[PDB]
Amino acid sequence: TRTLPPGVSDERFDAALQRFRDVVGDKWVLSTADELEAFRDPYPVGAAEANLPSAVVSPESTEQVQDIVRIANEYGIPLSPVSTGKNNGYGGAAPRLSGSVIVKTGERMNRILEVNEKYGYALLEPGVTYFDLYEYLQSHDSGLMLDCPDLGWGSVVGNTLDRGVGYTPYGDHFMWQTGLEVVLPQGEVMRTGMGALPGSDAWQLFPYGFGPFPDGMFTQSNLGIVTKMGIALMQRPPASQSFLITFDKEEDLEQIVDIMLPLRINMAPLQNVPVLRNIFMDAAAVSKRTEWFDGDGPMPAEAIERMKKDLDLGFWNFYGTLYGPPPLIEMYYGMIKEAFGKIPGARFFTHEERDDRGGHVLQDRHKINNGIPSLDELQLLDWVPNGGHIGFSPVSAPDGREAMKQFEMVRNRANEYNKDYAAQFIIGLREMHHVCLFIYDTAIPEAREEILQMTKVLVREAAEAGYGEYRTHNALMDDVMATFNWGDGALLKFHEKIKDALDPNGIIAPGKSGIWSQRFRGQNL
Amino acid sequence: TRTLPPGVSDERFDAALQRFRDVVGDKWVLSTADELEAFRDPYPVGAAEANLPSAVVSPESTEQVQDIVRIANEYGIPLSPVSTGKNNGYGGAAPRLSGSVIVKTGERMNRILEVNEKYGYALLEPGVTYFDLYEYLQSHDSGLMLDCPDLGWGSVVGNTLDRGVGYTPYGDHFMWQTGLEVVLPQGEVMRTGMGALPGSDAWQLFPYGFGPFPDGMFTQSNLGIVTKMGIALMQRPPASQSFLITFDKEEDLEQIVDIMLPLRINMAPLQNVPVLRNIFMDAAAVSKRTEWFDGDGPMPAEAIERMKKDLDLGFWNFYGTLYGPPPLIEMYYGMIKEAFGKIPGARFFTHEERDDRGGHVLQDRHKINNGIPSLDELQLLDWVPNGGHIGFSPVSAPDGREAMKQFEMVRNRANEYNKDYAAQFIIGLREMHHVCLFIYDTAIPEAREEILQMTKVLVREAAEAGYGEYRTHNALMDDVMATFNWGDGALLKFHEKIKDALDPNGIIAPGKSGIWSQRFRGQNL
Ligand SMILES: *Cc1cc2c(cc1C)nc1c(=O)[nH]c(=O)nc-1n2C[C@H](O)[C@H](O)[C@H](O)COP(=O)(O)OP(=O)(O)OC[C@H]1O[C@@H](n2cnc3c(N)ncnc32)[C@H](O)[C@@H]1O
Ligand SMILES: *Cc1cc2c(cc1C)nc1c(=O)[nH]c(=O)nc-1n2C[C@H](O)[C@H](O)[C@H](O)COP(=O)(O)OP(=O)(O)OC[C@H]1O[C@@H](n2cnc3c(N)ncnc32)[C@H](O)[C@@H]1O
Numbered sequence A, B: 001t002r003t004l005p006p007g008v009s010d011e012r013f014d015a016a017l018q019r020f021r022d023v024v025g026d027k028w029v030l031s032t033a034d035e036l037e038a039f040r041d042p043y044p045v046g047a048a049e050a051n052l053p054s055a056v057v058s059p060e061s062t063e064q065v066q067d068i069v070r071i072a073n074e075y076g077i078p079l080s081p082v083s084t085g086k087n088n089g090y091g092g093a094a095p096r097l098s099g100s101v102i103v104k105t106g107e108r109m110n111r112i113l114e115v116n117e118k119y120g121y122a123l124l125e126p127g128v129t130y131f132d133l134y135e136y137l138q139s140h141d142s143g144l145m146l147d148c149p150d151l152g153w154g155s156v157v158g159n160t161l162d163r164g165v166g167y168t169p170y171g172d173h174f175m176w177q178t179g180l181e182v183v184l185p186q187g188e189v190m191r192t193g194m195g196a197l198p199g200s201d202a203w204q205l206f207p208y209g210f211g212p213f214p215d216g217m218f219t220q221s222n223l224g225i226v227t228k229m230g231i232a233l234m235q236r237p238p239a240s241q242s243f244l245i246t247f248d249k250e251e252d253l254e255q256i257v258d259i260m261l262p263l264r265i266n267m268a269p270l271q272n273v274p275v276l277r278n279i280f281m282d283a284a285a286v287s288k289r290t291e292w293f294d295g296d297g298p299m300p301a302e303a304i305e306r307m308k309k310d311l312d313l314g315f316w317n318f319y320g321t322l323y324g325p326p327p328l329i330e331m332y333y334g335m336i337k338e339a340f341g342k343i344p345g346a347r348f349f350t351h352e353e354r355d356d357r358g359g360h361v362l363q364d365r366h367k368i369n370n371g372i373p374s375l376d377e378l379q380l381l382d383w384v385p386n387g388g389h390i391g392f393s394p395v396s397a398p399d400g401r402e403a404m405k406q407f408e409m410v411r412n413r414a415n416e417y418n419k420d421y422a423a424q425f426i427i428g429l430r431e432m433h434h435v436c437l438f439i440y441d442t443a444i445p446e447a448r449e450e451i452l453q454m455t456k457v458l459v460r461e462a463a464e465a466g467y468g469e470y471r472t473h474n475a476l477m478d479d480v481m482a483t484f485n486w487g488d489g490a491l492l493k494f495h496e497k498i499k500d501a502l503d504p505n506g507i508i509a510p511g512k513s514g515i516w517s518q519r520f521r522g523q524n525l
């Protein structure tokens, strides 16, 4: 049947659609079943249908966004804002609440408003992709570099709004976000920071402004539709060098992490955001599962050994980058070798030293860690047919015992539900994002349901061990928010109060981060 | 006459006081005229009496803070939270709204809850001063260092909650804040970030947690009473060196700033937060005004030259610190000399090369910039009798011309109101906090009034030129918030909406940052 917003009739939904067309143009509102297929989660989770959009609206400007918001308030139509809608692993462009209208800001609001070479910043609309900004920087012979996630087709803005991550020293996107413009849930427009001071030139210079600092409240949030965002850009260093350290054993995880911490916490000699990837992650990037194993169930030990040998990789593979004058690089690299060289079986390779298939990941990281966006990691989804992934993404202390515990816990369930567990620890100064990608066949109802049930188990079991997720998929948002229930669910109650105050009609992305406005609470969708 | 909360009778106040004594104990509620004299602003602004507390309550736990808040809500009594109450220049411990009860959290909530050597952080109650944490670190032979403002008697927490600043690489306090516990305006308690996850070890490891990120909303804010805060701590480097560069001309300001920017924006060779201080600031630190000029008006140029010559300082004096192995320090100092040595008249001194009176500020910065707290700068307040100061603190782009225009704009009004303009530019990566301290005799009603009128003029003039303040005094909060009125006052309306939703009875620090809850709006308070 036609997907309709909750509580809204065919007839009223038709009238609302026409008003959206009055604002944006007929070509810029999609509402047929065929046209909406493209906006389904590409990596669906759960057997049953879920996260169904009712329409897609593509506004050209902040004023059109305002008008759309006003219409949605009058009709009681929920709006789900995206930038580019490439949140794959977490839902793609699909709304948490079925029946919502997707507001695809990035389709037409895709301008680079300013790149300031002197002060090292950009001012962006939501449709500027990493590729788009890279092209700009290259075209203008900029001395600045961007910080990108693994896939360059996402949005500088949109990735930041979900507190996404990259891998240069500017890898904490939200840290470097400076100023934003947002349309609030009843249609009012607001600028944060120094941008609230008319005529200031400091909107991208000083993030805080005056008074309570609100920008974080627009991240992983349903408090508005963001229309402009600033971000600091790092100066490109004079030289760089990337390296891979292979570690032979699953059980080396503990020592790897413990040796890493003292080298990272001061931002030297580990200057970039290191990643520690398991052999499933690296093999999926360069090969299909049937190259190593075509039986049933989890891949046997002997098959794991063949991936390692054929690709010349370890069970754990550490990738980092160094920057600066050549002698600084050499000094740092020497320190890294000496430290991690304690682990029996450790082998080191720079980006100049390996040109082979297994080395493809190191070459990709050398691009990414130098702000050169890439789509090479899309190959991961060829690991099994109709491949998809979901991101289960607990936070870990930068402690080997903790990391090992988390690894063992996830691996036990992955094996039990027959899903391959590819791991990427993303290593900050004092924490790691432990990204667990389960790669699966999206066509098969039981695969999708095992994914859902396995990840619900892992959310709960992680939380019982004191671990929480940094980011999650539409299907897990209620379960993850339910783990952050210190003080009798104080955090969620606080969010809901602000939600209801700013969005009295319950319009913007209901259910994002488990935050449902009053009219939807307790309805279980 | 007895100071009472607004619309609260003598008897209703006496009843409240009793309820507060029941919670905290008799000794820990102050309510006599002369016990309250000590909580008046030490540097009063304006001729007329303002910012009068009705009582001070000193809780020993979060549970007590919750009960005090519940009592206040029942009675309609405003509560103005402070940590140590040393926000001198901006109000001291005094409340914005006369008749509020000061909640002096730090008197008895003064425990160092954790200092973690491995992960480099502290979890703190509000009463922990910089001197307290320093003593802890020294006693335990820690490898960590703290980051302090110029006066060590403040609160690690309280300073961060007003987005205050220090001078090491960790000098953006709010940037390094990681987790907090807050009592919300009806008495609910909440932990942010990973602290919301029961049993997490990552409260001080990963700041954002899950969902909308709220910690900024409790800074320069009246949304709660903070009871615990975490902060990252830097590893002490193996060596450090501080330096002074003196510049001879008032007109050198533009070139100093333009040369500085490329050396600062990448955190090297200017690793620390540089300060650029004028001769008035440095002379006040070491000498009284009457040493150089006796006369009620602006200091003549010949007296300025005498200050410079006797103290062997410039009109502009640049202070920085370098850290790391001794060869790194040498490369960076050499670069700094080569760049700033292009300004005619520039002279360079390390912390080993001055033992004279004018060198005293260098020695003090060498402490501060190494996380060694000091109160030597209290000498500034001896510039004139009964000395006080107010901070007029605009943000500047790191542009020489902008810094010069601000300098000239402020200097001109200072002349007109007969106040000396002491300047300290605090230089971030992409912005400067341009702190203007006006030092005056707090005992002369007319001087307190000129300070008020002058600074009201400066706020308006600066906003007409596109400059806003990062932080301000109780007397200026409304005027400063009024400058940030892009989009017909959008930012303030947003803040009011949240305030009213969290604080329906209008209890917590009414008027902080210009944010008044519903029962107080449109009033002359
Ligand atoms: C499958 C996968 C995913 C992945 C990755 C590797 C693989 C194989 N590596 C990643 C990495 O290195 N770092 C990282 O942060 N994420 C990584 N991913 C996940 C995903 O690809 C990316 O994060 C991607 O950049 C996110 O998608 P996009 O950038 O297109 O962002 P979006 O879908 O438009 O928005 C995400 C959410 O943010 C909120 N949002 C977005 N725009 C707005 C506006 N304008 N206003 C309000 N809120 C907005 C929404 O919640 C939206 O859903
Ligand atoms: C006169 C002066 C001041 C000064 C300075 C040099 C001189 C000569 N140099 C400074 C510097 O280098 N950096 C800096 O940040 N400030 C400097 N100042 C100003 C002042 O001395 C310090 O900032 C000082 O540390 C601040 O005072 P304190 O640390 O005691 O903090 P507070 O008065 O307790 O709190 C300030 C405000 O924060 C909010 N607050 C505080 N505690 C709470 C709790 N628990 N809950 C909610 N809000 C709280 C209040 O708004 C409070 O007024």
Ligand SMILES: C/C=C/c1ccc(O)c(OC)c1
Pocket (backbone or CB within 6 Å): A088, A089, A090, A150, A165, A390, A391, A393, A424, A426, A435, A437, A471
């Ligand atoms: C190789 C995968 C990287 C990744 C990093 C961070 C994420 O949140 C993520 O989500 C699917 C994926």
Ligand SMILES: C/C=C/c1ccc(O)c(OC)c1
Pocket (backbone or CB within 6 Å): B088, B089, B090, B150, B165, B390, B391, B393, B424, B426, B435, B437, B471
């Ligand atoms: C020497 C003055 C330092 C200072 C720095 C930052 C401030 O906000 C400030 O305010 C009174 C003072």
